[PDB]
């Protein structure tokens, strides 16, 4: 059992997708509240996922907590009452509009969380049991592919009401019998979710622990990360089976100050470093996906990043991955010791600049980028350890 | 360039090998400072003033 | 050739100056990291004292007394106090030793890290195909200083067992309170009755020990560390030069 | 052309040396530690 | 006292595998030594090339490795 | 012989127990140490 | 031997610290220099200061004697005993 | 052979006991030569 724990939005799900070279989980900020993920091996003809939905009781509990925080004047029977559900949904929408966006403020994030919780409870009411947790498979839920189920869970409301997700797929990493368990962010708003994650990591069944650390992007350590590290060190059973990963290392490739801060921090705290790793899950995963594309699809813009490239006014929004690839070629300098001679044009769009760079250079640049990401090193190290 | 020389055509790959050796060694990643050398290399090749 | 000799002499002078500057920066307190480590040391020591004393149990002291005297299954009620004193002193000494190890290793690692950047030490490898003896002497001094500091801590901590007059204050706790338990109240050889007096002896140990630890930590350890460093490193730097 | 351009290589080397120093020290330590052990079976068995 | 009395019996019982254990240990040590030796030669070639590059135009010498014994 | 030696050992160990006759103040108080301690015993030597 | 010499050096350096017994006015005030300075010491030669030698000698006596007496009579015996008993015993166990 | 092993163990125990006895004799002050040396130490220090 390999359990990934860390701060919310630390990239645990994205890091897992990078290890699997697959977009299985959802990297949604402000939406992954208490959703525990399990990955297990399965034959190519036995790829399957099992979805456990939050019971009506759990939904009512989190809805009550969110309403209490949001200071909405309603009763405790709102989730069952249609009109009360509509009232609370409109109240949350008004809060979000006043705050200017779901991700703009903490109150906005929690209001949107409650809104999507109620919407999912209404949508998935038939699949939600009053007390017990309801479990279903693709055949039960009429899902034709793992991608379709991943999209269904990617939706904000479905993730809001989904409790546990157990996917099964064919991967050499899982062949040995390794189970990848992604846990809710330790700093998640729900104290119960954080407690569940802490109990899981403390669980004896946890064979290995992977701690995803934000300082690579934050420049310092969060209080929740420090608390998790202290608890890990205190727990004798798991303190000798813990590996640390610094995700979002790309931010320090061009920012020298954050970089020196990271280096000083790592030298100061972690005396041993055979279990520490630095990686860029986003870049590694996206490069792995782009390796499967060709010019007919603009190297994935029309296929992989079609959802993220469609702007509201018809202009092609630059994918985060395209922006970070251009930044990697321009300022990171990790290309600065290779045979490639990339050149970023300021008179061109980010997407078109990307198109030109990979048209001139091809897949070898993507392979060098993935090597810079360093996912393979961490994967091989953990595999050798196991 | 007046001082353009042939010897350091492959200086690129030598530096690459050094950084690769540093990355390969797990314990030595505590001292990892490869990217200062990278920036100095970048201003070494195709220099700009 | 003579210019090379001049350069070597200047290199030696520069190394001596750098080492003196670093040690004196530590002494004055300008080394912020060392100040952080030392305040952590003091806070840990005070917290350990408070926690250990407030968690003291008479039964543990009696168990220690029984262990100390194998050929008897019973220990006199007075042995509780003696074993309490010895246990307190021993645990405090162990904490001192471990924290000293931590501090010394961290300081030496920081010094080594910041020493491998200056041109003075950088220039050695240019004209010589090795490092000379800097690392060897540094490690030797590390071991010597660690041994000296642990000896200092052990020697200073053993004085705590000595009964200070604050341990004899009658108004807080008289030692004769055992007789009331003995006179038919303790119907047996079991020390369960003595458990009633635990809070008073806890307060007495607080009164006796707190001044000792406060005085030692706040007065001596800083000066001891500064003196050991300044008296060990300087001759080593001269020998290296 | 003359003063600045060589300087870039100089600062590059100066910034490069530390990691090479660390690599050399670590490899030499490992080699000497490994060579410390005996090689003959007759003497090796005594340790066990 | 008794358990440590019969050390001879334990050694007689372990002599059947002592030889194999020693041979395996020697092989492991030699393998690791040769591995780090190969790494050292690669590093030495890299540093030699670097120094030759900068020698043509400037005076500097990065650390080489020789007679590690 | 074994039974009698066990009897003797078991009966003799009770002597260590502090009887009240060991606590008679009029003969010897235990606090007499403090007079030696208060600057009379100028050292850690138990000669006093 | 190394431990004991370190002990002695560390303990002896505290003597330089000015104890209040070094500041007793009634025995010797530090301002006595001004009388020599005010035209009495017609030059930069310190010959005039020689007059104050006995008072400073007595002041140093007062300051130092308690320090040395306390240290020698209190600490050194215990330090030696502790060093011996804590160094030899583990060595004897390793020898056994 | 077993008697030889017994003898070695007894030898180790005896050596430990002797060293402890000597050190504790010094500690108690029963070592007259050590007391002479220490009083010489103190007298020399005071005289100096």
Residue numbers in the entry:
A (entry chain H): 50 to 435
B (entry chain A): 1 to 49
C (entry chain E): 484 to 724
D (entry chain A): 436 to 483
E (entry chain A): 725 to 793
F (entry chain F): 629 to 676
G (entry chain D): 629 to 724
H (entry chain D): 484 to 531
Give me lines lifted from the publication on this model.
Yet, in contrast to other BDLPs, SynDLP forms high-molecular mass oligomers already in complete absence of an externally added membrane template and/or nucleotides. Using a segmented single-particle analysis workflow, we determined the structure of SynDLP oligomers at an overall resolution of 3.7 Å. Based on the determined cryo-EM map, we built a model of 8 SynDLP monomers, which represents a smaller part of the segmented SynDLP oligomer structure. The last 19 residues at the C-terminus could not be resolved in the cryo-EM density, and thus, the final refined atomic model includes amino acids (aa) 1-793 of SynDLP. The monomer model revealed a globular GD, linked via a flexible hinge region (hinge 2) to the mainly α-helical BSE domain, which is connected to an α-helical stalk via hinge 1. The oligomer structure showed a stalk backbone connected via a complex interaction network from which the BSE domains and the GDs protrude laterally outwards. The structure of SynDLP oligomers resembles the assembly of eukaryotic fission DLPs via a complex network of interactions in the stalk domain, mainly mediated by three distinct interfaces. The SynDLP structure indicated the formation of an intramolecular disulfide bridge between C8 and C777 that covalently connects the BSE1 and BSE3 domains. The structure of the SynDLP oligomers revealed only a small interface between adjacent GDs, whereas a large area of the GD of monomer 1 contacts the BSE1 domain of monomer 2. Yet, the determined cryo-EM structure of SynDLP did not indicate transverse contacts between GDs of adjacent monomers.
Unlike small (Ras-like) GTPases, DLPs are large mechanochemical GTPases with a molecular mass >60 kDa that use the energy gained via GTP hydrolysis for membrane binding and/or remodeling. While DLP family members are typically not highly conserved on the sequence level, with the exception of the GTPase domain (GD), the resolved structures reveal a conserved modular arrangement of all DLPs: The globular GD at the protein’s N-terminus is typically followed by an α-helical bundle signaling element (BSE) or neck domain that connects the GD to an α-helical stalk or trunk domain. Recently, a BDLP has also been identified in the genome of the cyanobacterium Synechocystis sp. PCC 6803 (SynDLP). Taken together, the recently predicted cyanobacterial DLP of Synechocystis sp. PCC 6803 (SynDLP) is a bona fide member of the dynamin superfamily as classified by activity and structure.
